[PDB]
């Protein structure tokens, strides 16, 4: 009995492989060969958000493109006025082992979670003046690895228990549970139009989900190890994935397959982040080797380096308007580059 | 107006600096171990779908956060990357043989993986009384699972408890040797294993081992090790 379903699974996977091969008429590098490279895209540290007690794990830009919320293992989420480097809030967490934080597009809420499995939502605009927990989204059976807001009410979380969930922050319940991974779902990023999101997992495959339907539409594969980071290309129709295999890849949704891969024989450190600059011409990736590297997203080779960290960079958020790129670090400095 | 925002920033820095001293003086510890290990009873001994069960205890004006990890998947290689700045990873094993090989595989995994190279491992061989009874009654013969035990002999420098019979001495020292073999196989010295047999004293044992870790880190920092 079961062997029949195993055979059909194998042959369906073969159908998908054949169809993907049929679509591959010209790999990206071929069509992009003619354009001039981005050149020497060097950058310099303009600011440095000094003040965390311990290693950082997230640094997300508000929709105003000026505040950055940095979350650290010290049990702190600090909101940085990135032009002046003032600290506008310090948000003491319940459980200090944070692994992700997010800034709502309105700036009203800051979400944060980690090994506690509870995705907290903090309210910044309280009448009492001080920050306080608005809701605590209990319900996962594993560490809440990454989360982002769809809107002030709906938040989407990717967790260690292989699921992703669409919560309702007013009720606190899971309005929809996404499932289909076979490992830890270590990364997530909602698309620019918020109609769907992707989540990369330690099964080394990245899955695209639509929040209006509740199931994976497409599955992408090609890494040789866990996917540590994922990020949508600003067009909302392609996304980058970066893995502990020290290589990151560009997937195109309509192409249903990987189109370019960013690697150089001298890099062996595992990825930790991926993020495009607003035009989509620069792909920024964070590494365990203490550096962050700048990749020409279409000429498909390295074009710049960000340096000066003592430890690995935990996150590499780029501002909404593109004016800067932040880099959180395990040495506690949030370097702001431009 | 903006200078008032600068003052706000200074106030936040004062808050962070008052927290820095506490964070610095308080000691983080992980508590790994098999489900059948005594980690639960060790946590019960110590005194002041959730994924983590931080408990706090104090000895001689040093206080510790022991982070008993709760509901998480068994693929530890990810949620372990958070803990790679603890002062010591307590690992607890049931010394009663069989699944001891799984405990040894855990220890290998804990000792060697790439992020933990500077973290000392405190290994509580718990449940010692049950091992002793199981050996004494002959309910299981360790040779059945470790052929070397048929050729191994007690060390000439062992110090068993008075009244302890040589059988359980053979057993204990064998098992501790088998773990310490994994410990020494890295041959790098940058982190050290502290096995114990085990009450009331387990807190004091953690304190002693942590004292040694802190002393060695101090020597290493000053380039004087």
């Amino acid at each position: 009995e079961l062997d029949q379903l195993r055979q059909e699974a194998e042959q369906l996977k073969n159908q998908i492989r054949d169809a993907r091969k049929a679509c591959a008429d010209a790999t990206l590098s071929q069509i992009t060969n003619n354009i001039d490279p981005v050149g020497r895209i060097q950058m310099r540290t303009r600011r440095t958000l000094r003040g965390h007690l311990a290693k950082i794990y997230a640094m997300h830009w508000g929709t105003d493109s000026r505040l950055l919320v940095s979350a650290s293992q010290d049990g702190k989420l600090i909101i940085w006025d990135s032009y002046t480097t003032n600290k506008v809030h310090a948000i003491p967490l319940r459980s200090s082992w944070v692994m992700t934080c997010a800034y709502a597009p309105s700036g009203n809420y800051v979400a944060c979670g980690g090994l506690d499995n509870i995705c907290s939502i903090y309210n910044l605009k309280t009448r009492e003046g001080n920050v306080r927990v608005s809701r605590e989204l209990a319900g996962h059976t594993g560490y809440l690895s990454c989360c982002r807001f769809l809107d002030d009410n709906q938040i989407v979380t990717s967790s260690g228990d292989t699921t992703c969930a669409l919560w309702d922050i007013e009720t606190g319940q899971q309005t929809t549970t996404f499932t289909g991974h076979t490992g830890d779902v270590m990364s997530l990023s909602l698309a620019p139009d918020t109609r769907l999101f992707v989540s990369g997992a330690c099964d080394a495959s990245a899955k695209l989900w639509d929040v209006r339907e509740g199931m994976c539409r497409q599955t992408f594969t090609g890494h040789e190890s866990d996917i540590n980071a994922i990020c949508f290309f600003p067009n909302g129709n392609a996304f980058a994935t970066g893995s502990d295999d020290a290589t990151c890849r560009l997937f195109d949704l309509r192409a249903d397959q990987e189109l370019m891969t960013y690697s150089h024989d001298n890099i062996i450190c595992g990825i930790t982040s991926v993020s495009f600059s607003k035009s989509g011409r620069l792909l920024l990736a964070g590494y365990d080797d203490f550096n962050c590297n700048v990749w020409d997203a279409l000429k498909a080779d390295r074009a710049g380096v960000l340096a000066g960290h003592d430890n690995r960079v935990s996150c590499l958020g780029v501002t909404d308007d593109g004016m800067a790129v932040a880099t959180g670090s395990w040495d506690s400095f949030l370097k702001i580059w431009n | 107006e903006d200078k008032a925002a600068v003052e706000r920033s200074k106030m936040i820095e004062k808050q962070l600096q008052k927290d820095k001293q506490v964070y610095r003086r308080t000691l983080r510890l992980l508590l790994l171990g098999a489900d059948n290990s005594g980690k639960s009873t060790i946590v019960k001994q110590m005194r002041i779908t959730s994924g983590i069960f931080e408990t706090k205890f104090q000895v001689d004006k040093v206080n510790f956060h022991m982070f008993d990890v709760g509901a998480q998947r068994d693929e530890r290689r990810k949620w372990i990357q958070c803990f790679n700045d603890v002062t010591a990873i307590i690992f607890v094993v049931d010394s009663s043989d069989n699944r001891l090989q799984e405990a040894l595989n855990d220890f290998k995994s804990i000792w060697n993986n790439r992020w933990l190279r500077t973290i000392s491992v405190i290994l509580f061989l718990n449940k010692q009384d049950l091992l002793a009874e199981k050996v004494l009654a002959g309910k299981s013969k360790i040779e059945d699972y470790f052929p070397e035990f048929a050729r191994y002999t007690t060390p000439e420098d062992a110090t068993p408890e008075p009244g302890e019979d040589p059988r359980v001495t053979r057993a204990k020292y064998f098992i501790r040797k088998e773990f310490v073999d994994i410990s020494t196989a890295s041959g790098d010295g940058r982190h050290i294993c502290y096995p114990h047999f085990t009450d009331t004293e387990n807190a004091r044992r953690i304190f002693n081992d942590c004292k040694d870790i802190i002393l060695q880190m101090n020597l290493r920092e000053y380039n004087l090790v």
Partner: single-chain antibody, 231 residues
């Protein structure tokens, strides 16, 4: 609820001394800067004193310096000495927390009466009273001796409404931002030295006297204020 209650005022002979008090609840008092603002029985508002969060700094008005003194346990105190005839006024406790996007002066106390038996930035208004009717739309204006645009690009005008016989409320802060809980009927604009506030589809809840205020530098001089009155 967020709440402020000042207390301790009363009748004083000229040259006397007294302590005014402010009490707070429902908000993280120690992180707020606390102001004092006063109102003569037949005049516009005047700024009095400021004490920052954590007591980092203190200021006073040019006609108040030294004679009064301020200190902040969810309470604040206002020392007074050599009390003048002109010190007769209704005194309001005012909170203000300062950071990017913050909303200073967002809450005013009930107010205590106390009765005694040129380098500044100064405000003026080309009007003192205006007829208005519900359903109609109205406007007001305010003018400055200095351009209130700080080098960072914010214009630091603040608009307050004093409904008759009660505490003021913040209408618009830094010359564009509508304060929370304010009906969306309001709007405002700023042009460096000259500023306006506008009401579309008035309702009787908006009747009262309107005070503009500059916040670029101490002392925080209020304008004389414009009355908008029914029919």
């Amino acid at each position: 609820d967020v709440q402020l209650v000042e207390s301790g005022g009363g009748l004083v002979q000229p040259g006397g001394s007294r302590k005014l008090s402010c009490s707070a609840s429902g908000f993280a008092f120690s992180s707020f800067g606390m102001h004092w603002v006063r109102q003569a029985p037949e005049k516009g508002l005047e700024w009095v004193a400021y004490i920052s969060s954590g007591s980092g700094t203190i200021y006073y008005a040019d006609t108040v310096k030294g004679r009064f003194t301020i200190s902040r346990k969810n309470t604040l105190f206002l020392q007074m000495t050599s009390l003048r005839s002109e010190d007769t006024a209704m005194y309001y406790c005012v909170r203000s927390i300062y950071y990017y996007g913050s909303s200073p002066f967002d809450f005013w106390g009930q107010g205590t009466t106390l009765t005694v038996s040129g380098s500044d930035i100064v405000m003026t208004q080309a009007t003192s009273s205006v007829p208005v009717t519900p359903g109609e739309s109205v406007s007001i204006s305010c003018r400055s001796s200095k351009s209130l645009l700080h080098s960072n690009g914010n214009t630091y005008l603040y608009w307050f409404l004093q409904r008759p016989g009660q505490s003021p409320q913040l209408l618009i802060y830094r010359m564009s931002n509508l304060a929370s809980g304010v009906p969306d009927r309001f709007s405002g604009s700023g042009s460096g030295t000259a500023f306006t506030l506008t009401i579309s589809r008035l309702e009787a809840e908006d009747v009262g006297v309107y005070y503009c205020m500059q916040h670029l530098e101490y002392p925080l001089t209020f304008g004389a204020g414009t009355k908008l009155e029914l029919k």
